[PDB]
């Protein structure tokens, strides 16, 4: 390998990297400007509005670290993104999607199940009930994707086996 | 090995594209060091200037990764 050729090979992708990285930085700064642990949905919503899955991934890798910050209303925003991530061809996106989905299931599936099972009874409560119905619809759709991937590991464990078991009630 | 330098730039960039900024910075700082060490084994002045230009471009990318990490770290939980 000659110096000129090596330099040429390296430099080819520089402008691409500069554009992608400066755009991601700007977008993350936008998300950060509305950040508050008191309501993390606001930043998640901004990320979804920017419409760049890479920014969603970076934000989920953060909020996946503290489940106590998640509220039921956030689920109906995140689940559609989880659905995209579980179909990504990038292993690391699938893993972020799996981590978020396990978080939702472990934190919210009993509550969703209880609310939907309750005897019929308040605008706030009725909004919450419709949120729960939407979560269930979204989880039911995701469960089919999960079932189609739970056997990929064979005899071995995998994040998709875990999710399939966590979704057994659906 | 120039081929090794090319390969490490590629890995740094792939990891950055994928949001694995920790690993990206290992490869970015490693290859900046590799290039600098190689640069000064070069005796032709203009060839050294050309490698320094490349080094500066890689440094720009690495600084962008560092800025992204600083922003992400600023999300306190």
């Amino acid at each position: 390998l000659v110096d000129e050729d090596a330099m040429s090979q390296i430099r080819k992708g520089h402008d691409t990297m500069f554009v992608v990285l400066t755009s991601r930085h700007k977008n993350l700064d936008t998300v950060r400007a509305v950040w508050t642990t008191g309501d993390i949905k606001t930043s998640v919503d901004s990320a979804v509005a920017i419409n760049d899955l890479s920014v969603v991934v970076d934000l989920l890798n953060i909020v996946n670290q503290k489940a106590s910050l998640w509220k039921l209303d956030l689920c109906t925003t995140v689940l559609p993104q989880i659905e995209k991530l579980l179909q990504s061809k990038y292993e690391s996106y699938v893993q972020t999607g799996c981590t978020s989905l396990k978080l939702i299931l472990q934190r919210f599936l009993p509550l969703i199940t209880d609310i939907l099972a309750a005897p019929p009874s308040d605008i706030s409560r009725e909004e919450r009930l419709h949120k729960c119905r939407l979560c269930f619809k979204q989880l039911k759709s995701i469960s089919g994707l999960v079932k189609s991937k739970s056997g990929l590991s064979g005899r071995h464990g995998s994040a998709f086996r875990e999710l399939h078991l966590l979704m057994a009630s659906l | 090995s120039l081929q090794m330098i090319v390969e490490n730039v590629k890995l740094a960039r792939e990891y950055a594209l994928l949001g694995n900024y920790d690993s990206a910075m290992v490869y970015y700082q490693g290859v900046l060091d590799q290039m600098n060490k190689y640069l000064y084994s070069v005796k032709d002045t203009h060839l050294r200037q050309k490698w320094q230009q490349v080094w500066q471009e890689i440094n720009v990318e690495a600084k962008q990764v560092k800025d992204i990490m600083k922003t992400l770290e600023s999300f306190k939980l």
Binding site: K12, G13, T16, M17, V20, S54, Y90 | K10, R13, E14, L17, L18
Partner: peptide
């Protein structure tokens, strides 16, 4: 990121 990845891959 796919386009950028293919650029970097080439």
């Amino acid at each position: 990121i796919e386009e950028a990845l293919q650029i970097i891959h080439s």
